[PDB]
Design a protein around this nucleic acid. Structure first.
Ligand SMILES: [K+]
Ligand SMILES: [K+]
Ligand SMILES: [K+]
Ligand SMILES: [K+]
Ligand SMILES: [K+]
Ligand SMILES: [K+]
Ligand SMILES: [K+]
Ligand SMILES: [K+]
Ligand SMILES: [K+]
Ligand SMILES: [K+]
Ligand SMILES: [K+]
Ligand SMILES: [K+]
Ligand SMILES: [K+]
Ligand SMILES: [K+]
Ligand SMILES: [K+]
Ligand SMILES: [K+]
Ligand SMILES: [K+]
Ligand SMILES: [K+]
Ligand SMILES: [K+]
Ligand SMILES: [Mg+2]
Ligand SMILES: [Mg+2]
Ligand SMILES: [Mg+2]
Ligand SMILES: [Mg+2]
Ligand SMILES: [Mg+2]
Ligand SMILES: [Mg+2]
Ligand SMILES: [Mg+2]
Ligand SMILES: [Mg+2]
Ligand SMILES: [Mg+2]
Ligand SMILES: [Mg+2]
Ligand SMILES: [Mg+2]
Ligand SMILES: [Mg+2]
Ligand SMILES: [Mg+2]
Ligand SMILES: [Mg+2]
Ligand SMILES: [Mg+2]
Ligand SMILES: [Mg+2]
Ligand SMILES: [Mg+2]
Ligand SMILES: [Mg+2]
Ligand SMILES: [Mg+2]
Ligand SMILES: [Mg+2]
Ligand SMILES: [Mg+2]
Ligand SMILES: [Mg+2]
Ligand SMILES: [Mg+2]
Ligand SMILES: [Mg+2]
Ligand SMILES: [Mg+2]
Ligand SMILES: [Mg+2]
Ligand SMILES: [Mg+2]
Ligand SMILES: [Mg+2]
Ligand SMILES: [Mg+2]
Ligand SMILES: [Mg+2]
Ligand SMILES: [Mg+2]
Ligand SMILES: [Mg+2]
Ligand SMILES: [Mg+2]
Ligand SMILES: [Mg+2]
Ligand SMILES: [Mg+2]
Ligand SMILES: [Mg+2]
Ligand SMILES: [Mg+2]
Ligand SMILES: [Mg+2]
Ligand SMILES: [Mg+2]
Ligand SMILES: [Mg+2]
Lengths: 101, 52, 51, 186, 41, 142, 132, 127, 147
RNA sequence: AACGACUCUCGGCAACGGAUAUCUCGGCUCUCGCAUCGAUGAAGAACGUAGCGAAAUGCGAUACUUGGUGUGAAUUGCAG
RNA sequence: GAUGAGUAGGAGGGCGCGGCGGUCGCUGCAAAACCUUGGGCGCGAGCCUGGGCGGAGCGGCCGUCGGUGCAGAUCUUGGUG
RNA sequence: CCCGUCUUGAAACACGGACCAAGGAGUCUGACAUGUGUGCGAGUCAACGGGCGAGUAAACCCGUAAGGCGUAAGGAAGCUG
RNA sequence: ACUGGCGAGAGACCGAUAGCGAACAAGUACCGCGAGGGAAAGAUGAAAAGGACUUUGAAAAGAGAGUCAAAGAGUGCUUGAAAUUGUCGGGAGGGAAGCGGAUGGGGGCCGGCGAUGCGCCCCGGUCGGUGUGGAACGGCGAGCCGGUCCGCCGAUCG
């Protein structure tokens, strides 16, 4: 048969938050990134980071090879957090795995 | 009809569901028009892209 | 977040400050909190309150 | 059995805490929970209750109205549990010490230009822990569109309640019931 | 005025003033509300 | 954290990577915190290792029954790699107990955590002894 | 990450393209790595398996077995290797199919086309990998 | 480990609350459901009928969720999570999660002995 | 948000909160604005006086641009002047600023409120009320008409 | 009023049946590109066609294909 | 310190199902599902765990979302007395 | 005393229900309204579109006499305010 | 503009009673004079390695054996729930049975179902100990106030 209340394409999918509120949220997120307690609380491994906020020389923008990019992360102490991401690579549980996720 | 409310005047007594215009192609339309302008600019070079 | 030096120096211009507005966000000023000092211990244990 | 109503329990509801999740507001509530308990000051108790209230129960106060109520009270500190807005209809702004939850950008600039100071409720606790020498003010609670529709229904006698209509004009609720020439005037 | 040290990479002014945005209020309620709504877009 | 600790507690008390909750949000709910600088692993502002500038860490250090006593430096809250003032102790329990009392209560660092730190030191020290030799008593009497 | 708009990352489409691929396409899909000795000689990493090639099994229960290819059964995505057989319940001998990605080519069935193919494979590596 | 709890556990009711008529009908499961019927004699609380659960049966807050051994249960999935109970070994006992491998259970059991943490199911799948 | 909808709280309660006696039928009082004069009469008279009937003259093909006439009050007139120009006004009492309201999207000047004390202003507008003109004059200003 | 039969009931095992779980060369929805049927006989319909085929797919008495070009050693259920 | 009835109806705090953004984990030294006269927790929705079967996936927590919870409808399809 | 149901009144000589599995019913959308949360505030709104951009359906930026709602009402209207 | 055609990309969509009626020889089988109506039906294993041979039977097939990690995967074969059925075992029954509450009998199950330590003595063993030197740091705000580790003396206990 026919499902109850069939789903329609003209459901209101999108949302328009006022621009000023979106700018408020971004500023709060930027400020939170400079608090080591919040960064640790979010699961990041910053135990070897020299300082927060972590500002590096502009020469990093000239890096072209991935091998040199990883060496830059090691020097500034950001590699352990990057290593955490790779070690967490896993298949998505549930139906999402067959949905191109 | 009940309580104190504005008198409703919804114009939804026809087969409106057959005449709904969605806008899911709005990002695509922006892309296509930008491509058309970019293509036009090269055709009329060095004439200004603003037109006449 | 890992900031480059150039990106870090642009934050004041992009988002402005509490005194002057942003250069790239027309008429935008950073929001103010309802509490200037969030350290309750200092306020509660201050001489003025404890007197 | 016991001859009581609802087993002797209260059927009244009041806000015992803010509905907001604002972390800064909760810190202010914690600050003034302590002040009210450990001082017994009536000012602190009133401030604590008003911090729980909803947006419509914390109406804004215009700068012009703030100036009029602060006339002759320069020494006192003005306290408002709400937002202070700027008023273009006010020309001369004297120096004044004002504590409020929030100041609009224009209102803050005008007060600071005139030599005044904009304070938060955490700074007020340091300067007036018991509310000494304070001018406690509230904005107009009933000055909003919704209230105009409240009260006796528009159609009853001696009513000036604003009706709900989608548009304004001769064709929108001006006929029978609104004048003697059409049935009756109500 | 607070300043932030600039880390130097091998083979390469060493401080920058702290921008005002880093002292902005932290509002998890606002961030969550904005994040959920815009992720629908 | 670089901001007031009370503000941090308002943010992380609802959700953080170290918060361990089991059995839902009813009566059966049990909550623990597993950050390394939480003496009792309790999810409270008192014991929180995230919302306090001054925190105490006591845990096994490497080998040889060494116990690490680390306290967060007050002026290094923005330098994670140098935030901890580590002190590896490998002496008798009595000597270690005096060191904890000196670095927690005597200097007025966190006098409210003196009891927790000593109990934390006592628990860590006992576990090291059992690891070296193995369980010998069930500790069920009384 | 891919950026070609003509390339799909859909799991459904990839599987359909693989299992409906024509015989000519299956030839490339049924490639095997060259031995370390041949790799250093021809400077080539992989080659489609051929009927008369000699391969060594490096995976599975027949790991270490060496023999000559006898049939490229493209319809079944396997190859048959001489002497790599099992006995049925009735005692008859049947060849065991092995995926070409699980063997190593020890000797190549060279010919006019095979030699030309080797040159093209080495030409790109000698330039795009070394000169760059 | 010596349990810290000292007050005796008093269970107001040990029998479960079985759904009405779950015995009669196979399709009606035993998990409790409040009967909403107008004539329901169970809802109206006629004597000699199935009993309904209410807040009066609430157990003492001091002895609530305590196992017969005198501890509260905390489910552990690895060695690291077991260490969270080091300072609560007189109040909380660990239980290894049902899906932990036998190899990893040995590590948890060995670690729990060093920390003097009670394990409720320490003999699970070791034979 | 489905999980907050109260229908979920009513699962297992039979009537879904619509009652056993009355029930939830399709249109037991007619659709939309049915029966405005018959069985919804009290509702219309009590909350919507004037709903039924005809009043006034028709205006075929009425265009709103002909009637465009934004208004500004006396109290708001000073706010139009830029802050830098306000300082000049108080720096020289011989001259007065010329406030052309039409440049700010206003046609008529009404007379609510008062002007700044001791500050003459020359107001340029299409229309003006008599009270507005009187307040401008008594403050030392003048009114100029434009179009 | 034992035993045993019968009925009911509880458990183990065996049946009956195809739920659940995990899957998917399918569906559905959005977006994009392109503009190309026919009297020079279209769409559709029919019949025939393979060493062993009924259907599906393909093809037209040159009938699961001819020819050119590309690819470069198979096809495969069996036979040859 | 007082107090406890509740159909129609309202509201609060919770339980459970499937995704999504995060975070913390489990698994061929055996995941899901299913079975059990094993044991335990919660007033309860439910939850945790022993054993068995099975042979490749799964779960906790925060936020967010929905085609999200059945004994009935001479309910639908299938199966069986 | 058999559940569900309509009923002043059901164990009813009122109706549905032999049994099991799975499926199975206040939803989506437009308008308005009260309440609450959030942003800004005599303003507010990046909404058509443009500039771009995770090589990109997101995010970010743009309102120059744009527009909506609000900032002034009364009158059928001419008008006054 | 574009729910057709051809080609392409994507998804907080469905996951075989779902999703198109159709995941499969589906607009097929089948029904109707006709216009039309219109299903059900996916999964052995990594590989058929798809069960040689012995024996019983007219045959189907069984018994034993064989292949496989597994036939407790044996060609509608992954997993295999409930209704319902057989069998073995326990138990009950004078025109229903079931159910609430309370014990009892018989079962089944449970060693975190129930402890065996602690304090003070000496025998031995083992391991560390005020005052001055170094190493890397800290609390309080230049200066005071500290602990940790290494070494050297004294002290001679723990
Ligand atoms: K469209
Ligand atoms: K209702
Ligand atoms: K029996
Ligand atoms: K399934
Ligand atoms: K023809
Ligand atoms: K050809
Ligand atoms: K997860
Ligand atoms: K169980
Ligand atoms: K969820
Ligand atoms: K009825
Ligand atoms: K009746
Ligand atoms: K009946
Ligand atoms: K209303
Ligand atoms: K506007
Ligand atoms: K613009
Ligand atoms: K009139
Ligand atoms: K179908
Ligand atoms: K199997
Ligand atoms: K049986
Ligand atoms: Mg699942
Ligand atoms: Mg219609
Ligand atoms: Mg009573
Ligand atoms: Mg009552
Ligand atoms: Mg008349
Ligand atoms: Mg009257
Ligand atoms: Mg119970
Ligand atoms: Mg009744
Ligand atoms: Mg298990
Ligand atoms: Mg009810
Ligand atoms: Mg009903
Ligand atoms: Mg009704
Ligand atoms: Mg209706
Ligand atoms: Mg064909
Ligand atoms: Mg009650
Ligand atoms: Mg789930
Ligand atoms: Mg059973
Ligand atoms: Mg769960
Ligand atoms: Mg769904
Ligand atoms: Mg549903
Ligand atoms: Mg059912
Ligand atoms: Mg029902
Ligand atoms: Mg039926
Ligand atoms: Mg049937
Ligand atoms: Mg029958
Ligand atoms: Mg009757
Ligand atoms: Mg009844
Ligand atoms: Mg009768
Ligand atoms: Mg009837
Ligand atoms: Mg019947
Ligand atoms: Mg169901
Ligand atoms: Mg509102
Ligand atoms: Mg305008
Ligand atoms: Mg007039
Ligand atoms: Mg098309
Ligand atoms: Mg189907
Ligand atoms: Mg399904
Ligand atoms: Mg399998
Ligand atoms: Mg099976
Ligand atoms: Mg059964």
């Amino acid at each position: 048969g026919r499902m109850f209340a069939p789903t329609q394409t003209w459901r209101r999918w999108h949302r328009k938050i006022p621009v000023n509120q979106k700018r408020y949220a971004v500023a709060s997120a930027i400020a939170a990134s400079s608090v080591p307690s919040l960064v640790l609380a979010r699961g990041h491994r910053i135990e070897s980071v020299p300082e927060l906020p972590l500002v590096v020389s502009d020469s990093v923008e000239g890096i072209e090879k991935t091998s040199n990019a990883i060496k830059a992360l090691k020097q500034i102490g950001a590699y352990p957090d990057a290593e955490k991401a790779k070690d967490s690579h896993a298949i998505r549980p549930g139906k999402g795995k067959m949905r191109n996720r | 009809m009940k309580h104190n409310n504005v008198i409703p005047n919804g114009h939804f007594k026809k087969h409106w569901q057959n005449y709904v215009r969605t806008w899911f192609n709005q990002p695509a339309r922006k892309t296509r028009r930008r491509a058309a302008r970019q293509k036009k600019a090269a055709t009329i070079f060095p004439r200004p892209t603003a037109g006449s | 977040i890992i900031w480059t030096k150039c990106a870090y120096e642009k934050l004041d211009a992009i988002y402005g400050t509490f005194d002057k507005p942003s250069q790239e966000k027309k008429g935008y000023l950073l929001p103010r909190p309802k509490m200037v000092n969030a350290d309750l211990a200092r306020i509660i244990n201050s001489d003025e309150v404890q007197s | 059995g016991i001859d009581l109503v609802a087993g002797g329990k209260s059927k009244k509801t009041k806000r015992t805490a803010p509905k907001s999740d604002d972390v800064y507001l909760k810190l202010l509530v914690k600050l003034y929970r302590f002040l009210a308990r450990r001082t017994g000051s009536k000012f602190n108790a009133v401030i604590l209750k008003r911090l729980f209230m909803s947006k419509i129960n914390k109406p804004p106060l215009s700068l012009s109205r703030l100036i009029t109520y602060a006339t002759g009270k320069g020494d006192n500190i003005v306290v408002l549990v709400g937002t202070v807005t700027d008023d273009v209809r006010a020309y001369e702004v004297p120096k004044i010490k004002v504590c409020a939850l929030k100041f609009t950008e224009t209102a803050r600039a005008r007060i600071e230009k005139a030599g005044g100071e904009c304070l938060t409720f955490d700074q007020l606790a340091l300067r007036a822990p018991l509310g000494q020498n304070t001018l406690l003010l509230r904005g107009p609670k009933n000055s909003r569109e919704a209230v105009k529709h409240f009260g006796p229904a528009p159609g009853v006698p001696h009513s000036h309640t604003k009706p709900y209509v989608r548009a304004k004009g001769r064709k929108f609720e001006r006929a029978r019931g609104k004048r003697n020439s059409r049935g009756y005037k109500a | 005025i607070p300043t932030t040290t600039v880390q130097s990479l091998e083979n390469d002014s060493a401080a920058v003033p702290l921008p005002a945005v880093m002292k902005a209020p932290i509002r998890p309620d606002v961030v969550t509300y904005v994040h959920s709504n815009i992720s629908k877009n | 954290t670089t901001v007031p600790g009370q503000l941090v507690w308002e943010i992380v008390k609802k959700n953080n990577s170290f918060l361990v909750k089991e059995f839902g949000n009813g009566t059966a709910g049990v909550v623990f915190s597993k950050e390394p600088n939480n003496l009792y692993n309790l999810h409270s502002y008192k014991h929180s290792g995230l919302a306090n500038k001054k925190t105490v860490t006591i845990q096994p250090d490497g080998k040889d029954k060494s116990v690490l006593l680390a306290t967060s430096k007050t002026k290094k809250q923005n330098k994670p790699s140098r935030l901890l003032n580590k002190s590896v102790m490998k002496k008798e329990f009595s000597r270690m107990a005096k060191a904890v009392t000196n670095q927690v209560g005597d200097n007025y660092y966190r006098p409210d955590l003196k009891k927790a730190a000593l109990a934390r030191l006592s628990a860590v020290h006992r576990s090291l002894k059992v690891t070296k030799s193995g369980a010998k008593k069930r500790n069920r009497q009384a | 990450m891919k950026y070609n708009p003509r390339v799909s990352s859909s799991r459904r489409k990839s599987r359909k393209a693989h299992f409906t691929a024509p015989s000519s396409v299956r030839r490339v899909l049924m490639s095997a790595p060259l031995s370390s000795e041949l790799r250093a000689k021809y400077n080539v990493r992989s080659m489609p398996v051929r009927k008369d090639d000699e391969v060594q099994v490096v995976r599975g229960t027949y790991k270490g077995r060496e023999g000559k290819v006898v049939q490229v059964y493209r319809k079944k995505w396997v190859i048959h290797i001489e002497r790599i057989t099992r006995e049925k319940v009735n005692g008859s001998t049947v060849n065991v199919g092995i995926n070409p990605s699980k063997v190593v080519v020890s000797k190549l069935r060279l010919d006019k086309d095979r030699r030309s193919l080797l040159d093209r494979k080495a030409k790109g590596r000698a330039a795009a990998d070394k000169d760059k | 480990a010596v349990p810290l709890l000292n007050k005796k556990v008093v269970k107001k009711r040990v029998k479960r609350f079985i759904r009405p008529q779950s015995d009669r009908r196979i399709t009606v499961k035993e998990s409790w459901r409040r009967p909403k019927g107008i004539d329901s004699r169970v809802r109206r609380k006629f004597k000699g009928c199935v009993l309904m659960p209410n807040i009066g049966y609430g157990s003492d807050k001091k002895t609530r969720h305590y196992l017969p051994n005198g501890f509260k249960k905390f489910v552990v999935h690895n060695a690291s999570e077991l260490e969270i109970l080091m300072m609560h070994n007189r109040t909380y006992c660990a239980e290894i999660a049902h899906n932990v491998s036998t190899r990893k259970r040995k590590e948890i059991v060995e670690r729990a002995a060093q920390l003097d943490v009670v394990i409720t199911n320490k003999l699970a799948r070791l034979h | 948000t489905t999980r907050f909808k109260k229908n979920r709280k009513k699962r297992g309660h039979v009537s879904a909160g619509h009652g056993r006696i009355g029930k939830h039928r399709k249109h037991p009082g007619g659709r939309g604005n049915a029966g405005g004069m018959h069985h919804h009469r009290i509702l219309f008279d009590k909350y919507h006086p004037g709903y039924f009937g005809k009043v006034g003259m028709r205006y075929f093909h009425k265009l709103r641009n002909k009637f465009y006439c934004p208004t500004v009050n006396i109290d708001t007139l000073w706010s139009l002047v830029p802050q830098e120009v306000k300082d000049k006004a108080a720096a020289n009492k011989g001259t007065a600023p010329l406030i052309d309201v039409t440049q700010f999207g206003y046609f008529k000047v009404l007379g609510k409120g008062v002007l700044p004390t001791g500050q003459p202003v020359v107001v340029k507008a299409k229309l003006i009320s008599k009270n507005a003109e009187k307040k401008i004059k008594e403050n030392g200003g003048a009114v100029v008409l434009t179009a």
